[PDB]
Design a protein around this ligand. Structure first.
Ligand code: 7GP
Ligand code: 7GP
Ligand code: PLP
Ligand code: PLP
Lengths: 810, 810
């Protein structure tokens, strides 16, 4: 059908069809007379999977032959989404499979909708890991993603009575055709026990053992025949576990619960024992695998030359003391040498500055669960503080501030401090974020070791976030500059010479209209909801959190509604405001914000006077597969976090690459995006980081804004009086109280400027031609935000390896 | 290699080899350079499996077309063992696969040893179900085996310090290539709740739901292209289960524990709630499946014409009230009609007369777990007793004896009484057992409804128990009478005309010697133990139980040892006494018997004076795969249960078919075996059932035997003094006390006759030619014990269907 989707050769289509029928028969044990759509999806999945195996086996054989330096990306989250279409795209099989299935009388897009999302992540941090795996494979790096195979990923969100309801994400129910269990590589992981000091070294004994069974999933590079591996560990009890008889067998569940479910928190630390077990479980199994592979290449001096371990935040921070434990206790290396190796091997990436998100584990927990690691952590701290003391003699407060051990009610271990001390590189995920790390929270560390601190601005993969989700746009682009940009996104800059091209302007606008029509239809299909495709699609999709300020968006929506009610027969640009995202199960305020959003919709969507001029929809169960549908259909991207709180953001990059304009604060990557496209082509508003600081020094008083802004006052009074909750007048009392007395994110402070900026947005939308020309300027300058650029920087500046665009023999 | 193993055609061998390489590559994702023996086993398993699918799909399509009466065999146990070789045998692919793998440079027998046994059973009852499935498929019946897919089957037995240790049987660890999950057919099962009586009928509400997910395994008939299905249910929690958040997800384990593990009891009832849940779980899911299939053919009058439900003991007895519940509560049929249908549909098979084995569930348990079923059971009882009262007016004691409800400390429901009342046929499993049922425990029922009672003597499948485990014997037999006997075992009678054939006599003896050599080698390989292949192999393998009297065997062994020590330089026929079997985890006496056996071995096997004249070995982890090895190697089969306790026995039939002579009591099927072969060709000894009764009426006093038999006295004194337990002198005090004061099985009463009989055995073994001639007379008359004969009788006399030997188009 479309160029970018590859060729549909005669031989290939015929081959695909026969293999499809083979799998339906032999693999699924069914015939066309009883086969259901799900059966057809699996037949197709197994067919595409077969094309991966050959490349997968030789890629791994290749690494064994050349023995390049290996990159190990440790993360407790890998937000992969669906794998079928992505695999076809990277193997250039999309049109062939489309044709083959067509000839079999099946609609491939229908079959793709059957695949369950691999939701092994919460949001940005987990999705970044997924984009990174794609880019590392596309850049020919010998990389391995290591994580946990959660039986249940992020919960499926249901909206009942306007409230969020959570239900288990049993994503493995029908099986996962992409993974390959590798029980032969099962490894033991130890917990509890005690430390015994002998004549020669310490020994960790009387431990409880849990087995780690790996499952491998292929990660195909973009048309370069490279297929890397993502290895996820599953917890299994040993067979002699607890070995009345029946109960002992039933109790195996206790050990296997480690890999049972993903903790559903976004930017929030919950110090639960099960979470700590998950963190050590992944680290312990992974390091044994790493060392095993390293020995199968005694000389640990070359370990850092053959191994790089990237810690995705502090979740896998125990890799530092675990590596020391293995080198010192098991390999018998002296401390100083072991430490040198550890530092040169490990690198740490920080993803947030919010205090409530930082991991600070109670000493009593580590003491009982990992006694040897606690001892190693104390030793690390001692030697580290000795270095601080020597560099800043007499500065006693610096010593207590930099200690890995925090004193107080309960002693805690600051995992971020542990990571900085034991890593040769520490990076933020956006220029402004990395600067904040050096100026504030990690200032002391930066002063001691300035060379360790770096920046690696986030990015997204243009394969899934352009070619896959927006083929129409990828096509009109390829028509004018070729297909090379898909693996070299900077080439989109060539589109700047088409900003005045009447043909291109029309094609860009047409693609957007088609995407909106398709999405508008989807809303009625799976969610029975009517919307006007001619309206401006104003969307904010991301996890629900106070810092992301979905509440500020709500205030604007209510303002628009009140203005219409005030002057009904006055013209206003029609808008469809879409807000979606999940709230952590125990985050009360976040759940109240979801209820408020639906409550507003209940009033706005049924007001005869408003008509089809304003609609407020809450997008249920926002996840990767849904993102692929709504983002290509958006006109306006809401990135309005309080300046200094969103480390980077990545959803923002997705919207920019897909033809939406952005309204946002100078926060995270928004700053670099505006810088790339030109501030005149971005809708920036609100306080800058410096403005927020000035306000805090003076003291934030919400009452002041309430007293001086009539429209704001009205909204607050409507909320308090029960205007949006007739049956429950004080339903939103908590929201109002927070807004008025303890709003850590200064919602009111940016209200006026936000509303004003939104008016400028509506003004430009009234001029289709100019709106589209600005869109072209955004798409054309989004090249810097490809994760291929991000990974190339990690490779050269942190891992010490060169990326390659060379294909491997098929 | 050998005829009976099929042809090794050029086309087939080439095809097998290429498909083997295909699976190794695409399915296992490996190459010959990293593949392990396990990888090769799976490649072969998937290759053979492919040959089953075509036949499987068309067999099921066939039944849908012809719509024959369906047979549903409900059992909580299916002791299947390994599936690879059995599948090759039934598909006539053994030599081809043997050749194909040979050419690939692999030893197929080595790969077969890698497969895990499907140990979803305890012993005889579970193995019978497996043999039955094989025979029903071989006889072309539209049969379905329905059970539970236990995550853990019968525990693996380890012997430590002479004691039995149990370890989890994680048989699914590496995956099961034979099963096919069918999540699309998942069904809900209800528990707890309460009964609500409305205007029209009762309703079962406020129940907890557990999902039943089916897994199908193919059951190939012998070379007739028929492939039936064994459907095993797995427990799954609904996704809204218990839906803080984390705990709710972790608690899903509570529901899924239903299919977690097999209760390890043999002939013993344990009234645990989890077991009751398993019983209802299998019954509820199965009946919905049955009714669904029936409707997909309103007219329930024809239900009995299209459906037959066979209850393997009382474990699935809830099928009776569950069927009534569905017909009355859901389909709205009147009671009388529903009952008529139920009785005509259900048939019950009893497998034991031991009181401790009968299921008697506490009313308070059913009351809480299945409130509606308890009400239905009371109603059934009421109507049944009204019938008894009308047939035997004034006989008030008969009423209390026949009631389904037993009064006393705690009210209980007698499941056997429920089964007889609700079944149109009730059968024992051996002539003597079926007679005992009518004369004793079910006497009252027999008097009320004599027509219901039948006998169906057990049998074993000659495919697994001859062709598969003893190819050498199957071959020399086929050489003289052809291959037809494999599916018509009665033809073995033709071997009687070779009893004087010097060539045959030599071949039979040679096959046995080869089997003994092979097994003798195996003992050293996997268990490092030396044995004399020239000695008589005296074996008793079966679950450890007091009624099976492994203790009587022990007494004989000690007698042999004492006699040797008394006259060292006296000649005695050399023997290797092998005893094996598992003991239920909570059966103390059984565990003590295992310890005694190893203790005896510790003394006997290391006594210089004994030399290689006597060896006592305990066969560890006795299971189906081990049975296939030791039975073909046996010379003497020990079937010495107290007369009237072993309902039938099936191991006895296995030994007879494989060339071993039998020493046993006139119990269970032993009676019919001796009758078939001629008592002169059997070593029968001990009390008959009538003798046991006479002794009980008079009162069994063990002391009498102890006082009048010097050799017995010596053994008891050795046991008590610590002769077999130096460090722990009173270690076997419990055994001696039981033997002397409360032996329910009269071990001493059969001691003298047993020892005498054993002397006659040794005498015949000294004459190789005559021993072999007697063996030939046993093999030649073992035809009646084929499960094909058993199933044909069930088919014609109970299910009302005709067996077929016609092949289906391949
Ligand atoms: C560990 C605490 O961090 C998170 O939960 C988290 O998801 N942080 C997120 O990581 C993304 C990828 O770097 C950033 O773009 C987002 O701004 C940040 O909030
Ligand atoms: C339910 C209680 O019965 C058993 O546990 C059991 O395994 N019984 C066994 O069933 C076999 C097959 O009919 C018979 O041959 C054995 O004699 C009987 O003990
Ligand atoms: C890209 C993505 C995110 C991150 O979005 P931000 O707006 O940067 O927080 C979260 N969830 C999903 C499903 C995503 O695809
Ligand atoms: C045949 C068999 C049984 C039944 O043996 P009996 O001696 O009749 O109790 C038990 N276990 C296994 C593994 C068997 O193969």
């Amino acid at each position: 059908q479309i160029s970018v989707r590859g060729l549909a050769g005669v031989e290939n289509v015929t081959e695909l069809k026969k293999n499809f029928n083979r799998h339906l028969h032999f693999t699924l044990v069914k015939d066309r007379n009883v086969a259901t759509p799900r059966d057809y999806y699996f037949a197709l999945a197994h067919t595409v999977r077969d094309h991966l195996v050959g490349r997968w086996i030789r890629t791994q054989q290749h690494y064994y032959e050349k023995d390049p330096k290996r990159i190990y990306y440790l993360s407790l989250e890998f937000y992969m989404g669906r794998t079928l279409q992505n695999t076809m795209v990277n193997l250039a099989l999309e049109n062939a499979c489309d044709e083959a299935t067509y000839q079999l009388g099946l609609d491939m897009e229908e079959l793709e909708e059957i695949e369950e999302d691999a939701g092994l992540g919460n949001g940005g941090l987990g999705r970044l890991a997924a984009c990174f795996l794609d880019s590392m494979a596309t850049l020919g790096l010998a990389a391995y993603g290591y994580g946990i195979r959660y039986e249940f990923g992020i919960f499926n969100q249901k909206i009942c009575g306007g409230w969020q309801m959570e239900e288990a994400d049993d994503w493995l129910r029908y099986g996962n055709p992409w993974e390959k269990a590798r029980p032969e590589f099962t490894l033991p992981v130890h917990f509890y026990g005690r430390v015994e000091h002998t004549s020669q070294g310490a020994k960790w004994v009387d431990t409880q053992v849990v087995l780690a069974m790996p499952y491998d999933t292929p990660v195909p590079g973009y048309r370069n025949n490279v297929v890397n591996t993502m290895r996820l560990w599953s917890a299994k009890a040993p067979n002699d576990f607890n070995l009345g008889y029946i109960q002992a067998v039933l109790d195996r569940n206790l050990a296997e619960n480690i890999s049972r479910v993903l903790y559903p928190n976004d930017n929030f630390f919950e110090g639960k024992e099960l979470r700590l077990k998950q963190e050590y479980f992944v680290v312990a199994a992974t390091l044994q695998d790493i060392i095993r592979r390293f020995k199968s290449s005694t000389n640990f001096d070359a370990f850092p030359d053959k191994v790089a371990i990237q810690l995705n935040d502090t979740h896998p921070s125990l890799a530092i003391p675990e590596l020391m434990r293995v080198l010192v206790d098991l390999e018998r290396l002296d401390w100083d040498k072991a430490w040198e190796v550890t530092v040169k091997t490990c690198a740490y990436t920080n993803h947030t500055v919010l205090p409530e998100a930082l991991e600070r584990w109670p000493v009593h927990l580590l003491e009982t669960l990992l006694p040897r690691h606690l001892q190693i952590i104390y030793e690390i701290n001692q030697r580290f503080l000795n270095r601080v003391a020597a560099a800043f003699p007499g500065d006693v407060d610096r010593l207590r501030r930099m200690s890995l051990v925090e004193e107080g009610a309960v002693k805690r271990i600051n995992m971020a401090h542990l990571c900085i001390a034991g890593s040769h590189a520490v990076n933020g995920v956006a220029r402004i974020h990395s600067e904040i790390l050096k100026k504030t929270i990690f200032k002391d560390f930066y002063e001691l070791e300035p060379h360790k601190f770096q920046n690696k601005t986030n990015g997204i993969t243009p394969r899934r976030w352009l070619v896959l989700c927006n083929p129409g746009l990828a096509e009109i682009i390829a028509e004018r500059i070729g297909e090379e940009y898909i693996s070299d996104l900077d080439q989109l800059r060539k589109l700047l010479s088409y900003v005045d091209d009447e043909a291109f302007i029309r094609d860009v606008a047409k693609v957007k209209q088609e995407n909106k029509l398709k999405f508008a239809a989807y809303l009625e299909r799976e969610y029975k909801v009517h919307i006007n495709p001619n309206s401006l699609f104003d969307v904010q999709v991301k996890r629900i959190h106070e810092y992301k300020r979905q509440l500020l968006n709500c205030l604007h929506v209510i303002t628009l509604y009140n203005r219409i009610k005030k002057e009904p027969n006055k013209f206003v640009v029609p808008r469809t405001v879409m807000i979606g995202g999940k709230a952590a199960p125990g985050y009360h305020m976040a759940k109240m914000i979801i209820k408020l959003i639906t409550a507003i919709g209940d009033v706005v969507n049924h007001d005869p006077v408003v008509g089809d001029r304003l609609r407020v929809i809450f997008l249920e169960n926002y996840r990767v597969s849904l993102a692929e549908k709504v983002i290509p259909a958006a006109d306006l991207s809401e990135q309005i976090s309080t300046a200094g709180t969103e480390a980077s953001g990545t959803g923002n990059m997705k919207f920019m690459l897909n033809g939406a304009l952005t309204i946002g604060t100078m926060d995270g990557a928004n700053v670099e995006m505006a810088e790339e496209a030109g501030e005149e082509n971005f809708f920036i508003f609100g306080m800058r980081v410096e403005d927020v600081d000035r306000l805090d020094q003076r003291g934030y008083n919400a009452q002041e804004y309430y007293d001086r802004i009539p429209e704001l006052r009205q909204i607050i009074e409507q909320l308090s009086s029960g205007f949006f909750s007739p049956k429950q007048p004080d339903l939103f009392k908590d929201i109002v109280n927070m807004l008025m007395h303890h709003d850590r994110f200064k919602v009111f402070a940016d209200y006026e400027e936000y509303v004003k900026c939104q008016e400028r947005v509506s003004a430009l939308y009234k001029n289709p031609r100019e709106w589209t020309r600005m869109v072209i300027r955004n798409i054309a300058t989004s090249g810097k935000f490809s994760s291929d650029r991000t990974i190339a920087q990690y490779a050269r500046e942190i891992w010490g390896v060169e990326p390659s665009r060379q294909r491997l023999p098929a």
